[PDB]
Paper text:
Ferritin represents a ubiquitous class of nanocage-like proteins that are primarily involved in maintaining iron homeostasis. Accordingly, ferritin plays a central role in taking up iron (as Fe2+) and storing it in a stable and unreactive form (as Fe3+-oxide/hydroxide). The crystal structure revealed that TgFer presented a typically 4–3–2 symmetry in a cage-like, spherical shell composed of 24 identical subunits, featuring highly conserved organization in both the ferroxidase center and the 3-fold channel. Each of TgFer subunits is characterized by a four-α-helix bundle containing two antiparallel helix pairs (A, B and C, D) and a fifth short E-helix that forms an angle of approx. 60° with respect to the four-helical bundle.
By contrast, we also observed that merely one copper ion (Cu-1) was present at site A of the ferroxidase site in TgFer + Cu and TgFer + CuFe. After incubation with Fe2+ ions, the site containing the Cu2+ ion was not replaced with an Fe2+ ion, and this was confirmed based on the anomalous difference Fourier map. Similar to the crystal structure of TgFer + Cu, two Cu2+ ions with occupancies of 90% in TgFer + CuFe are bound to the 3-fold channel based on the anomalous difference electron density map. One copper ion (Cu-2) on the outer surface of the ferritin shell had six coordinated waters with the Cu–Wat distance of 2.52 ± 0.20 Å, and the intermetallic distance Cu-2–Cu-3 in the sites is 4.25 ± 0.34 Å. The other copper ion (Cu-3) positioned deeper inside the 3-fold symmetry channel is coordinated by the OD1 from Asp129 residue (distance of 2.68 ± 0.02 Å) and the OE2 from Glu132 residue (distance of 2.78 ± 0.04 Å). In TgFer + CuFe, two Cu2+ ions were tightly coordinated with the Asp129 and Glu132 residues of the 3-fold pore, similar to the structure of TgFer + Cu, and the Cu-Cu distance was approximately 4.5 Å and 3.9 Å, respectively. The results revealed that copper could be able to compete with iron for uptake in TgFer + CuFe, likely due to the preferential binding of the Cu2+ ion with His residue (imidazole nitrogen) over the iron ion. Similarly, significant differences in the iron contents were observed between TgFer + Fe and TgFer + CuFe proteins, which were measured at 2,637 ± 2.46 and 240 ± 0.97 atoms per cage, respectively. In this work, the crystal structures of TgFer + Cu and TgFer + CuFe had been solved by X-ray diffraction analysis at 2.3 and 3.9 Å resolution, respectively. Obviously, a low-resolution diffraction data not only present a challenge to structure determination, but also hamper interpretation of mechanistic details.
Numbering used by the authors:
A (entry chain B), B (entry chain C), C (entry chain B), D (entry chain C): 3 to 170
Write the structure that this text describes.
């Protein structure tokens, strides 16, 4: 029943919970990369600054999702945040590639939550996602594919250094 | 056959009219409560200030729909504005409670109008509704449910006066 | 071997990892409380703001710990972040009591990491903990016990409201 | 028997003297490298600027110890300052590498002096060392190991010149 509940189906509420946890996994994985470039044997501190921002950015998307969950009458059920697969992510190009599939995975999750809110006619929730998440995911997915092509252009060695200084 | 008509079904035109009339009823009902907390034997000026705001909200929310009705080529068919059910709304709780079901009633009327734009392929009218009405309704519906909870906590007496001073 | 390693024992490195994960659990639990007071049926938004800060504050202690782990030659091994015990923490007094045992638990963990660095004569690590963590824990433990005594003084109802407005 | 002597064992006094002499050797060695990157056939002015800084760091680090030796009632027994092993330090890498082991050598000499304050119950002299020397040494030792990694990445040639311009 709750108090502000209207047009908010039970499947949608459990999807926001399932999505809240994945957005936290993204924040975790990005922090794992942050401190892979603060590692002294890599020492790319502007790459590290990138993932520190991106980790905080995703933690703010989870918060924006939980803040929405409370605004619609649902209740927040948190689950364990699983550790990232790797603890050492290789070259910058390799790590940026990992990020692409990550945000590409996080995107399709959002795209399927939108499909659920459509199933039970949740027009507002559809707008909230397509305005505050889908619009941002396509931005992040391009800017990551932008960094992928450049890191391939500059190559290794001096290329990995000069891309940290000038672009990041 | 009006100059700017495109993709605008007469069913959607009629819905905006019936919806304009309802958004005005909410202005009247909130104004009824405005001048209730200014009663000499109610004397809650900040609750009065809250409904003076909210009454002007709905009035400008109806003006936006009217401005949209002309923007799409429909014609504004006005109707009578019914007097509110009550002439006195009891405790601040029982007033806020009447407000919740009011916005909750208006939210469905907006949602059903959104279903009418979807029935006739009006992609624009969908975004206008879910962007400048449904988005606001969800926030307000929470905001009211936040006041109901706190009023139940502070209880009758000094708790009612304090909520007026510190929150409103 | 690594590159900057000196006087940094294997037990200490695994303790920083084990402590990094617990500091994240603290950040998680605090966020769970943050959104328990953004819940519309509780709606204490200055209590919620407290745990939003405290959750971010602990996430910055983990970062300060990982930043230290990289500065001393150790490597960061992350583990799963377990979900908080409860998803609804009861009255404010009850939640603040939970927090006390939390920071009291997180303290003794730090106190025992200090004992490990002492075992293998890690004078710097001892200073880093007793300057940047132990000094802050005793501050946080008092300010939480301060909030515990007051919430007992003001009681329930109007007391729980007026403490959110004036002090938080 | 000096005026401000308390808790200050002659073993600690002797250690500060031998440590003062070493902190000056690091000033000389860094100055040796300063005027090496100003050689007409090295011509790396930013690497020169780095060692002009670091040479003045150790000189002021010895002055702090001297100021502390007088602060505790000990007397400053100066000794000769040995010339550095080399008169030319090769590539920027092989120079930075010589610097790592230099600070790593100085860090142990500080740590062993800290063990001398602990052997004779000098709680203050412990905090002065671990507060204004050991804390800095850990940071510098990382900072050097960060430069070694990046120089190995950028490689000889244009990579050496670019690191001079963009990082130093
Ligand atoms: Cu995201
Ligand atoms: Cu409205
Ligand atoms: Cu902490
Ligand atoms: Cu020094």
């Amino acid at each position: 029943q709750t108090q502000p509940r209207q047009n908010f189906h039970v499947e949608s509420e459990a999807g926001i919970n399932k999505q809240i946890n994945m957005e936290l996994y993204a924040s975790y994985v990005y922090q794992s990369m942050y401190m892979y470039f603060d590692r002294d044997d890599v020492a790319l501190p502007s790459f590290a600054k990138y993932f520190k921002h991106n980790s905080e950015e995703e933690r703010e998307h989870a918060e924006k999702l939980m803040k929405y969950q409370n605004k619609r009458g649902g209740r927040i059920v948190l689950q364990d945040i699983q550790k990232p697969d790797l603890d050492e992510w290789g070259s910058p190009l390799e790590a940026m590639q990992t990020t692409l599939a990550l945000e590409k995975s996080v995107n399709q999750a959002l795209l399927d939550l939108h499909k659920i809110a459509d199933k039970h006619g949740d027009a507002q929730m559809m707008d909230f996602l397509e305005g505050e998440y889908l619009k941002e995911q396509v931005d992040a997915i391009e800017e990551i594919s932008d960094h992928i092509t450049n890191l391939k252009r500059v190559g290794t060695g001096l290329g990995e250094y000069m891309y940290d200084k000038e672009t990041m």
